[PDB]
Design a protein around this ligand. Sequence first.
Ligand SMILES: C[C@@H]1C[C@@H]([C@H](O)CC2CC(=O)NC(=O)C2)C(=O)[C@@H](C)C1
Lengths: 213, 52, 289, 160
Amino acid sequence: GRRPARCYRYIKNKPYPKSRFCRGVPDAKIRIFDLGNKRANVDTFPACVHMMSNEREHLSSEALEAARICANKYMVKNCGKDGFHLRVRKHPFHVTRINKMLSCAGADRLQTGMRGAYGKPQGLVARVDIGDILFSMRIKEGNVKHAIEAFRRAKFKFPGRQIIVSSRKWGFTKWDREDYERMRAEGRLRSDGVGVQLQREHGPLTKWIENPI
Amino acid sequence: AKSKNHTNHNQNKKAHRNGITKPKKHIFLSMKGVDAKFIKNLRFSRKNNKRQ
Amino acid sequence: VKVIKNKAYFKRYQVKLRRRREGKTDYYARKRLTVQDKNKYNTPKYRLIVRITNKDVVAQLAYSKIEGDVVVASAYSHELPRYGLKVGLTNYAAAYATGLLLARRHLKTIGLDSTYKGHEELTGEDYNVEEEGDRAPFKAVLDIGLARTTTGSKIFAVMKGVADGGINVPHSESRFFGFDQESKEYNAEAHRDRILGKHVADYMTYLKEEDEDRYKRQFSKFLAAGLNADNLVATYQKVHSAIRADASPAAKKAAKPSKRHTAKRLTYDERKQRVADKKALLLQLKEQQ
Amino acid sequence: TNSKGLRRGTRYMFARDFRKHGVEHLSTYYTQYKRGDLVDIKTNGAFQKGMPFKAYHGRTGRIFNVTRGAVGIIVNKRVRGNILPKRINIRIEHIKPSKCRTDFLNRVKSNDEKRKAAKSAGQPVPALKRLPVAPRGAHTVTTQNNEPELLAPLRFEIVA
RNA sequence: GCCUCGAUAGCUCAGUUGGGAGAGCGUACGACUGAAGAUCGUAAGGUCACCAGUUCGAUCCUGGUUCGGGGCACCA
RNA sequence: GCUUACGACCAUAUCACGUUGAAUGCACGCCAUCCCGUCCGAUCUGGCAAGUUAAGCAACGUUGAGUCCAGUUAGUACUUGGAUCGGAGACGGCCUGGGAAUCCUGGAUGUUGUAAGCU
RNA sequence: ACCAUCUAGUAGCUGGUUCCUUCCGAAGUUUCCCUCAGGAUAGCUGGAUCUCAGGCAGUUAUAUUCGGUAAAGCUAAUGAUUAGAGGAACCUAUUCUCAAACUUUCAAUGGAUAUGAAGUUGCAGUUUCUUUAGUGAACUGUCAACGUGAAUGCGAGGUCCAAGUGGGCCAUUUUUGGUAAGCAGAACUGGCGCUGUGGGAUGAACCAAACGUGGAGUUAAGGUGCCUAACUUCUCGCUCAUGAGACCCCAUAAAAGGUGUUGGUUGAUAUUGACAGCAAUCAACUAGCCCUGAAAAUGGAUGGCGCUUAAGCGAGAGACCUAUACUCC
RNA sequence: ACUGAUUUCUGCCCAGUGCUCUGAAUGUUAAAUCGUAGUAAUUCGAGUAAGCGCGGGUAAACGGCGGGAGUAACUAUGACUC
RNA sequence: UCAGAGAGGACGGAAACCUCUCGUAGAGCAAAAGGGCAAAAGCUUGCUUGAUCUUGACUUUCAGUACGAGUACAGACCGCGAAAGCGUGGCCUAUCGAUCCUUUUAAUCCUGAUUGUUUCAGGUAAGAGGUGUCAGAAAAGUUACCACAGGGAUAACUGGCUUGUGGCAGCCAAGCGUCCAUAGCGACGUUGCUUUUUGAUCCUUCGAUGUCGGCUCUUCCUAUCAUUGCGAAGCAGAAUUCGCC
RNA sequence: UUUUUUUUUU
Ligand SMILES: C[C@@H]1C[C@@H]([C@H](O)CC2CC(=O)NC(=O)C2)C(=O)[C@@H](C)C1
């Protein structure tokens, strides 16, 4: 069976990503990372909520997927599949190791002790720090209550302490809502699907004319 | 009974116990390891210079 | 198709040295040609640069420094009309004459011409200036640049000219004209004839016999200058004699006033004004289209 | 334990600088080195011959021999409680003139010139000693067009 | 757990340095027989266990993965 | 204001497109008997001077890319030394000194030596 | 088998190794060894002294340099990796998250060198080296002139003979293996070992401070209700716990909760009379103390007794007590 | 030497290791002997016994004595087949 | 001038060869990895033997010993090049060996001491034959019939730290529970507790702490099976479940 | 030299 999370909770070793040196790493449990109305236009979901961590620990792929499913079910049932866009902002890339030992009577005969104790891959965990964003979501201003309740329900699936906050930014973009609105009215921000691109000044006036800013 | 146990714990203290000895000042005077041709010419020059 | 010369490519690009980009200096050979042994310190190492343009032959003497080479003497084929020749300033005879002029000129300048006269009788035999008295002959190492080293090349013609003038240029007769690569034999008579331009006169006669029109098309300005296939050798001999008689450089003229012929770079305000004008014009066209 | 090869751990030490590979510029060879001069050692990976050992990289030494295309250098090396003046034959490409000694020579030249000039002109001998920067002296500051600004700490703001 | 060995037609087994994939039985066709079986004459057939690399070309040579099989797993 | 030979620093010099180019020069260019080298006079080599600035090359243009410099980021990140400092811990702040780098913003677009020459 | 002798057999192993004072005073680290319980070797240490009377330094300043770790970057190369956008894949510009064996860039600490007399200017000789060349390089001379060129501290250097050691351990920070370990392995420095003394009730390592033998005074850390020398001293708050809490290492406690109480943040309603019943109120948060979460075996531990406007928790003030420490005798 | 009254039986294997029997066997073999060269020490070569190597026997000598697939008018199993 | 890309050309196709553009090295350089390299260190080709003879100095390991490897010179004779120049093996970082003995090469060498000649033998100098446990003994097992000097530097039983494993208890609720997440359970996750499991370690004990189980006899702890007093049920009652003191 | 079989009732 899987070892308790307390064994690999805290960050102690250097990063151990899957590479040519570490082979035979089992697939991580969490595969999906963007749920809800992911293909939404930038303006569909102006309100944004973050779920930050207050601990420097390891978030297992199992825990990440558990929180994902919990929040996704809550929002699908309370607000519809096409009313939100949830983004898991943390990917499990750190590999933990286990030094398996036999646990039957007489195991000491075949046990190797501490000689050559380098472990084998066990699972994929995501290294987290204080202030790191675990979950993010963009929704309509009339669904912030559901967003906060969903993040509340999900945080109990993670170890340690998490804090749910609402961001001043326009959805997942990098501009506060007021500046985003002003720049979009001006013509400096071009739709980039979920996000937007800044249209800088410099360059040939031939492309300038296509959108005079 | 493992007995490899290498370390560098007290070695700096031992080295500084008697002070770190800097190199002498006459080491730059010897012509050891200088070019043989140059040394030969120098020997010829020194052999011939008139004292007075 | 994926774009190759993109932002990352230009970010990572490293430009070769200026002269390698210009395809004008071979640095691998230059390092070996110009670098002096560190135990000789700041003693100059002298290089005889030979170059052949489409219409001229350049021979120079130089030595290197941290801030650029120092050319000490020079001689150009276009400077031969003072010693005669008006045409054929690129052939073997002109190259040899330019080399001889350079050698005599620099020996005069450094005051060794009287001590070292070199070979004053053109015979085509290999000649190495032999040390006379106490002062050894001036020494230079040949620099051909990017020219191919073939037997009978005009670069080696210039080198032979300098060596005959009396500058110690280390060399072998292997790549002189008249040296047979197969039998490894040297034909001094053939080399002398090529130096004196007998090949040019032979071509003149051959074309004159073959076709008059082709002969004129080939030797138009030779005839205008009055050089025919029975006078060229004597002309080259006279040129050699004049070069050996006098080799001082020609005097310099006065500096004429100069006026701008090219456009001057716009200022910051001018560039911004042009930007504004183009913006206004483009907006006008967009509105009117 | 580590292997004891010559170039162990020199991956970045012996590498060229970014966008700096290729042909070696010729001022390196044109530079003049004389016995008694001080030179810094910085290995050039592009020249595998006459390389200095990794322990002498970034160290300054004094030349004692000048060969065709190399120099013998005396470099101090720490070995336990003694500093050994090791002798190494390094090629020119791995060598660079040291500027500390030339700066000191310039200062000595200036000192001698000032002393000679003052003595010839009859002036008193001037001060020729470097002094540590002394504490700032007394002065006055005017507030005209520079009125003091009252500063206070700022309140905490939740920056999401 | 450690140390080895093997994986090739439907089945059982060879095979070469690396340049052919074979042997037997099985399957299909024709013949002999009243018919079947034996017998005779033909044909087609393999995941070279999977992957990556090495060289001109790899079933073969090298490394890793999956399955199976063998030996050891002792003191007190 | 320029051209050539040889350079030094090796993009502020590179790259893209375009305009102009007086004089020297460079270059393209014509020919292939001879020297020389190729399947091929394309390259290389040799003899020349009808023609051209078309290209190279030089100067200039571009709200040009790159490169370089500066500001901002920011006294921020990080960090030396101190505490019978806070906290269960992870960590956090304070005292004492050092102190960055991206994004973004603005500017610059080769300098120069020896020799020869043009204007 | 037994008896005598070789025989006091050899032992890198165990045990012991006998008077007093004075001075100095370590190592468990390097290399080689059929080497790992042992040696030789260098290091650390003692003694004898000898040559002299300014050049050195576990410290700074100035000048010049080396590095690729922290931070930073991947909308820069390599390797991963989510999502769409504009022209199923493909291209373009983006985007989320990463690297011990990635990097354009790049600290702080850190390393090295130089900072004058063994120097600087000239003049005047030598060379068979070097140069076309007194052209250079170097040297030589009882050559001529100039005179100490950052701070602070301080006497410096040389030779010989030889011991013990060559099981280490602990701590702040960094760090590898391991689920962890009073586990195993490393880096810098300081310690214990070798070391007593005041304090932490007790302790090899913690805090203070190192020691001849005495005295007076003052303190460090720590403390002042009684054990116990020093106040039930002074000011403001918080806390009631059916065994509260009580001082670095340190002698366990978490997620989650409380309509206990005390402060704060935000948003509303309210005197055009706010909530309850036929004059402030409401809601969500936040963090101090307290409570629940909180189960182990002989009877027992803020050290004990006890303490509740404390003798507890936090911020502070006067004075006072006390070292083998500091001053003086 | 092994086995171990009586009763009833004592199967297959001589490939391995032993033991043993023949030898024509120039396959391999020491000392001695013989021949060659040399002035001699000495060098080269030839023979050269037993043994070993070739052949046969022997297990109441030491000892040893297999795998994988398919298959029967319900299934199962597998007399049978490869 | 490479890897590669784009665009063209009978058979020719995704892939044969030819052609033109672009191409910062994305190729190649005997091998592992990392550095380095573009008129080259890569590819093609010509000629060659510097992979030769000789002594010192130095770097690396380091005791500043040796071997090995390498660096910069000096003397000789050479190779390539027109020349400057480059060359003592491999672009650099690994690719290897003491004493004794044998063997070979070298001098028109030295010695065999009663005088000489020739064999023979021994020496001086440089290589090879090998020690891979690679600073270099010539080396198969078993002991339960066992012995000695020691070791808690070192294992097996207890004790000590740790708790992966073992056991026990919590938090959010996706679902089960006819409907109903919480009567009673509770997945995906996650927080703790305990030392009646087995492991990890090797701190104490090897000049000895008698090492399983049972019997007998005390006392203690509860995480409560029964009984006392209670609260809650998917509690109408023999019965049964959860919870509290 | 080799030469095995022929479903039940009629
Ligand atoms: C060169 C190598 C070694 C040599 C010989 O055996 C070495 C000697 C060494 C020593 O000192 N004493 C001895 O008894 C043997 C020999 O015949 C071969 C193995 C080859």
